[PDB]
Design a protein around this ligand. Structure first.
Ligand SMILES: CCCCCCCCCCCCC/C=C\[C@H](O)[C@H](N)CO
Ligand SMILES: CCCCCCCCCCCCC/C=C\[C@H](O)[C@H](N)CO
Ligand SMILES: *C(=O)CCCCCCCCCCCCC
Ligand SMILES: *C(=O)CCCCCCCCCCCCC
Ligand SMILES: *C(=O)CCCCCCCCCCCCC
Lengths: 60, 268, 235, 5, 283, 235, 60, 151, 32, 60, 60, 5, 5
């Protein structure tokens, strides 16, 4: 049941990896993976009904 | 070479300028790295750089100094020594950021009857010690930065005792390389020796060296040039010999970022 | 038992650690998520949203609605600044409390390009050209159009497109700047000038406001998490 | 056994 | 492909010579060191060389925890006139001399930092009272975050700053930190200023220290005894050990030859004579 | 829990240990390296660079520029030494502060071949032959050319190639020598003599300096890391 | 995710090996491998533009 | 003064391991050192002391030996040190075969100096059977805790 | 698929311009 | 990197084995295997140049 | 150079295209087209005045 | 699984 | 993986 993931190696001395095994039945007990996703800001930065083309007039 | 070519006879051409020499001791490329422009993979400011090319990457001759039996040594900082040199200086003061490499050509001829040896050292981050024992790190910008005239080394540390109006200058002791380390070890820095019987010049090609890809040329000097008499000047049986030393330095692969109005520094 | 040897760090509590621990409520029936609108995945998304700058923090205008209003008028052309601002997004008092400024105050380091958008709120009949400027650091901060012109700038013509944006491009010596006032990592100068002048016909207000907004570009990032000074709990 | 990411 | 623990080159057997080849003659003016080996100037035998440079690799040279500071804290009686001492230290390797000198063989460096904390305590007054086991809080306060004014004020909440709660008498505390510089390498030497003095500005206004870059380079460690005031006063010391892991270094320098005098390269009068008397023709 | 048994060494802090430990700044955005010139991978690279020897540590010449200058003159031939030096690279006062000497003072043991290069700094018109010597230990240290001749040596003819190198070959009983003065691991004797004499024409300086340099050969190594005595912090 | 490397065996009593598993996501938490490379000293010992041949005159 | 201890490393201060090693002339081995630490009160006082941390510093031949319990050498930037906490498992480290010879000599029939005729007797003299004066260096041990009212 | 530790977008080299394309001109009333 | 060796089982209750993993880079840190070899005593008990045949006269 | 073999020297030969103050000091001449001449066995040195003109031909 | 150097 | 003696 071992999970093997890679580290993003910052300062250097191949891919360096690390190992994780969950010891508990409840996912609440698990550490955080930090393997997170990003998304586009659009729902906040461009919430407009008609798609904005930045080279065009915002108002036409 | 069988067609006459020699280690001792060189010609260097940059921009509209040429240096010749008939008594060189080869030439040095610091850390084996030739100067280069900043690569896109290492780039940092995003604006289009200014790259003046032949307008600034050319040989500039600084004021000639004089070597005598009492000379303890001289020092210059780069880019500071070139801050007033033609379009290099202009491009420097108009931009926030700038990086540059250099060809440093130290000139000093004499005769087969003179003797003496100058150690010519190029030091990255050549931090020099101050004149005070009441305050550390207190050398003023104006005294740290002499421009083309440079500064000199002394054989004696002598503390500034005027506490009301402190001198705020360096007190660089020669056998301590002006920074608290022994001069005999300065040879780990890129160097050549002008030993009068052997050669009449030193040539050091310096890459841009820094912990950053580009930086403030006006706030920070990347390289220091230190010239010290390892063996004193001597001639025939004269008590007061003199021979001149001339520095000619060329910026190489220099580029600038962050264009605005010109910087007008307080230099006195 | 398996032979083991306790190493340094043993038994400490590092508040930034990432370990497993026993669940106090085993087999608990968790309520499923629902698809709530407005999920955020990264704090920099919030930094990319325009929020309004409190430009005029004068003694009488600060901490009032007036601090957001930069007053313009139809006076004859001058080369004197409408406003002057330091590019210190986490520490200059005009930027530090914007949403960008606030998020930056939970981090030690920032990097990337920024953008300032100005909104003209005068009447349709009012015309004008303004010069918006960014001078990277190292020289005399621009106090006259003559100097500001020489740096990064946008000449804004007022008209139907009400607003104009100047991008402050990432131009720095260091790879990251500090989120405090620091000369080594200083950012330079934002300023706004009259290019021509505001002109109005008769029967029209001769004075009006512009509003300004700041936000981060897609190349903007922060690092080294830290506590802010923007909140406290004395006693 | 082992997962690999 | 050559590794730090590889054996150095074998000595090859070499015999007598009479030629125009002149390895012994050179010219140091060029800036080069003559790459000679014994077989160039004497007769040699074949030797299979087993020695290696493994312990002088940059990593191995630095692979040790060095003490960089001693922080003092206490926990007094509640009745004291003097405040409960909590400690504040600006992070640096320049308060002590040994690791500093080793790092300064080089101009620039990159490394991950391992910090280990050794904590000791004692009684001060010739009392007979006891104290229950102490817990210490070591808070990292990065440049910008609020510095504690009192041992118990709001900043010790640490919602975002990293803190270590250390229990007395347990194994010394330890954390790692990545390469955190704002430059691509740490500068052991900065020949410059953090401000340009402008002519149009006053001298005071354009002034700054020689060789100093960011005023608060790496922030602060603040340490406190978390336990409330106790009738018998206990004083503690936290010794901080720094080890540079995963290290790279650039541009070699002559080592510090005269005593350190402040965070810069400055030297004090009276310390400038390291070398001793020895006669030129005396072994 | 997994049955475990704590072994000796448990909970100690060895300053030379090599263990993992938790990161205080998780997910920190590290700044990438750039290709800075001058990277060093091993301290022995520094030991292979020539640095200049403070040969003349007389009471008046020590701790001044003069200590690096060995004075020669055109006097009639003598069999008396120009200089005498012990092969104790970390402890003899003339060698201990060179870059080689300095690095050796962070280690307990050294081994390998070394080399001494001398630079003639007189005028082009000055000629001369010198004898540079290495006597391995065990006999009377050479005080006359007659004895020095019998050991490892180079007869240096002065001319266009300004400098000359003598290699001190690794000749030792032990596999490594101590970095302190020790009779069991003694290295022997370096000395320089006039082979003929310095000759100059008229109108020429009759006295001049030679400079000397030491560096390690490619077969040179050190071990057992230690603190130096070359720096301290009293109080 | 186990890394198996060999030891350079000094005093003796095949290849003897040792095992390493990284327990953390951040490479900064990792111990030092000590699996380091060497390089030629030339950038410091022979920084000259024209390659030096040691049997030849350094100056010609 | 506060007593810190200095010991020149050797197996010859006690007799039992010495006799066993001396069944042989030469040896090679890796060395395992284990440290057992005990403490007590001395004065018929009633005062207490908080738990002690000890520093065991290895000082190889050449490195500066401590003159005071608290001087600069205890910084240990390069010397190996063990910080041991009282009442925990006894400390332990290993050391490789560290000899400067290809084996440890349990017996050396010789001197470290040759007496020369041209030199004085004093100058050529040395102890019988002794090789390197400081064979393996020193262990220096101290209590890291500051002074306490009860000793 | 874009992760939190992915590098942000590269700056692309861009030259001079003279067109009807007006990126700098906008209208914040829209809410964008 | 696990080493699996057999035990010489003395008192009994197949081959019983035990497992060993080295945790450190330096072989000096390793425990002792006790997997040692024996040799003939001859270099000490029969150091003679001419091979001894025990049924024969030692001197002929 | 017609001095003796024993005489050494470095000279600066300069060409300043027109339009500024004619060089009367090395400082100004350095900034234009120039050759720094080292005196030695090759007795002579050449500076090329490159065609640098506004007009396609100059008047005589 | 396992890497081997 | 595993060695076996
Ligand atoms: C809970 C404890 C957290 C401890 C966090 C410490 C973070 C700060 C790391 C400081 C890095 C110091 C690096 C050394 C100095 C620099 O080399 C030079 N002064 C040049 O920049
Ligand atoms: C932090 C504790 C480090 C301890 C380091 C100890 C290193 C020194 C090892 C000493 C080896 C002693 C070997 C025994 C003696 C020799 O056999 C004989 N006297 C012959 O050489
Ligand atoms: C998947 O996990 C199969 C491989 C098992 C690897 C060894 C497990 C290490 C010990 C985990 C103990 C159980 C935790 C309750
Ligand atoms: C790769 O690692 C797969 C094999 C797993 C071997 C057993 C792992 C031992 C326990 C590691 C625990 C996880 C560390 C957080
Ligand atoms: C070879 O070792 C591959 C199999 C790994 C088995 C589990 C290892 C158990 C934990 C060892 C940790 C690393 C020791 C530093």
């Amino acid at each position: 049941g071992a999970q093997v993931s890679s580290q993003k190696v910052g300062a250097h001395e191949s891919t360096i990896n690390y190992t994780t095994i969950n010891y508990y039945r409840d996912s609440a007990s698990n550490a955080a993976s930090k393997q997170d996703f990003s998304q586009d800001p659009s729902k906040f930065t461009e919430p407009i009904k008609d798609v904005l083309i930045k080279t065009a007039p915002m108002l036409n | 070479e069988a067609c006459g070519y020699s280690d001792r006879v060189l010609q260097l051409t940059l921009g509209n300028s040429t240096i010749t020499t008939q008594e060189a001791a080869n030439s040095v490329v610091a850390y084996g790295r030739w100067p280069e422009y900043l690569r896109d993979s290492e780039a940092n400011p995003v604006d289009q750089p200014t790259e003046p090319d032949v307008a600034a990457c050319r040989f500039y001759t600084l004021d000639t100094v004089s070597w005598t039996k009492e000379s303890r040594g001289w020092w210059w900082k780069l880019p500071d020594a070139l801050r007033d040199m033609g379009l290099f200086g202009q491009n420097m003061y108009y931009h926030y950021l700038g990086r540059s490499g250099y060809t440093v050509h130290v000139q000093c001829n004499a005769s087969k009857f003179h003797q003496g040896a100058l150690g010519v050292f190029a030091v990255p981050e050549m931090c020099l010690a101050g004149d005070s024992n009441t305050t550390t790190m207190h050398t003023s910008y104006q005294n740290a930065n002499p421009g083309e005239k440079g500064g000199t080394f002394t054989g004696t540390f002598t503390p500034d005792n005027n506490q009301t109006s402190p001198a705020r200058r360096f007190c660089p002791v020669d056998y301590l390389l002006g920074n608290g380390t022994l001069l005999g070890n300065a040879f780990v820095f890129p160097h050549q020796i002008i030993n009068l019987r052997t050669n009449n010049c030193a040539t050091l090609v310096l890459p841009y060296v820094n912990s950053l890809s580009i930086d403030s040329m006006v706030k920070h000097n990347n390289w220091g040039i230190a010239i010290l008499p390892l063996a004193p000047l001597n001639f025939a049986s004269e008590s007061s010999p003199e021979i001149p030393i001339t520095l000619t330095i060329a910026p190489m692969c220099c580029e600038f970022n962050g264009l605005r109005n010109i910087t007008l520094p307080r230099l006195q | 038992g398996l032979p083991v040897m306790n190493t340094p760090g043993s038994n400490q509590y590092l508040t930034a650690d990432n370990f497993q621990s026993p669940c106090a409520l085993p087999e608990f029936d968790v309520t499923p998520p629902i698809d709530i609108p407005g999920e955020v995945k990264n704090m920099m998304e919030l930094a990319e949203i325009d929020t309004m700058i409190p430009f005029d923090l004068s003694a009488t205008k600060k901490n009032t609605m007036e601090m957001y209003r930069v007053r313009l008028s139809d006076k004859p052309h001058t080369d004197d600044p409408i406003l002057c601002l330091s590019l210190s997004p986490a520490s200059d008092p005009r930027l530090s409390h914007t949403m960008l400024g606030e998020i930056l105050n939970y981090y030690t380091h920032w990097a990337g390009s920024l953008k300032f958008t100005f909104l003209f709120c005068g009447s349709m009949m009012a015309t004008g050209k303004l010069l918006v400027s960014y001078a990277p650091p190292g020289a005399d901060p621009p106090k006259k159009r003559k100097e500001a012109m020489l740096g990064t700038h946008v000449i804004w013509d007022i008209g139907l497109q009400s607003s104009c944006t100047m991008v402050v491009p990432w131009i720095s010596n260091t790879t990251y700047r500090q989120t405090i006032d620091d000369s080594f990592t200083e950012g330079g100068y934002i300023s706004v000038f009259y290019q021509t002048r505001i002109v109005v016909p008769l029967s029209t207000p001769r004075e009006m406001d512009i509003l300004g907004f700041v936000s981060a570009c897609n190349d903007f990032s922060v690092r080294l998490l830290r506590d802010t000074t923007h909140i406290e709990q004395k006693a | 056994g082992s997962s690999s990411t | 492909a050559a590794t730090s623990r590889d054996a150095l080159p074998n000595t090859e057997a070499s015999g007598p010579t009479h030629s125009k080849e002149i390895p012994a003659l050179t010219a140091v003016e060029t800036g080069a060191t003559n790459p000679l080996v014994p077989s160039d100037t004497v007769q040699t035998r074949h030797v299979v060389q087993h020695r290696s440079r493994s312990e002088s690799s940059i990593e191995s040279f630095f692979a040790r925890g060095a003490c960089v500071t001693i922080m003092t804290v206490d926990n007094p009686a509640s009745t004291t006139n003097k405040d409960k001492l909590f400690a504040v230290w600006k992070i640096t390797y320049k308060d002590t001399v040994q690791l500093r000198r080793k790092l300064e063989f080089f101009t620039y460096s990159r490394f991950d930092m391992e910090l280990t904390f050794v904590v000791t305590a004692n009684f001060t007054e010739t009392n007979n009272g006891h104290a229950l086991n102490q817990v210490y809080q070591i808070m990292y306060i990065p440049p910008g975050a609020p510095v504690p004014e009192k041992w118990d004020d709001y900043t010790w909440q640490t919602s975002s700053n990293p803190s270590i709660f250390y229990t007395y008498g347990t194994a010394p505390a330890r954390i790692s930190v990545p390469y955190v510089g704002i430059s691509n390498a740490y500068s052991h030497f900065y020949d410059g200023f953090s401000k340009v003095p402008l002519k149009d500005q006053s001298a005071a206004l354009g002034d700054s220290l020689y060789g100093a870059a960011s005023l608060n380079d790496f922030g602060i460690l603040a340490v406190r005894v978390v336990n409330d005031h106790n009738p018998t006063k206990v004083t503690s010391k936290i010794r901080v050990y720094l080890k540079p892991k995963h290290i790279r270094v650039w541009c070699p320098r002559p080592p510090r030859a005269v005593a350190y005098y402040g965070p810069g390269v400055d030297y004090k009068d009276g310390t400038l004579t390291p070398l001793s008397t020895k006669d030129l023709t005396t072994y």
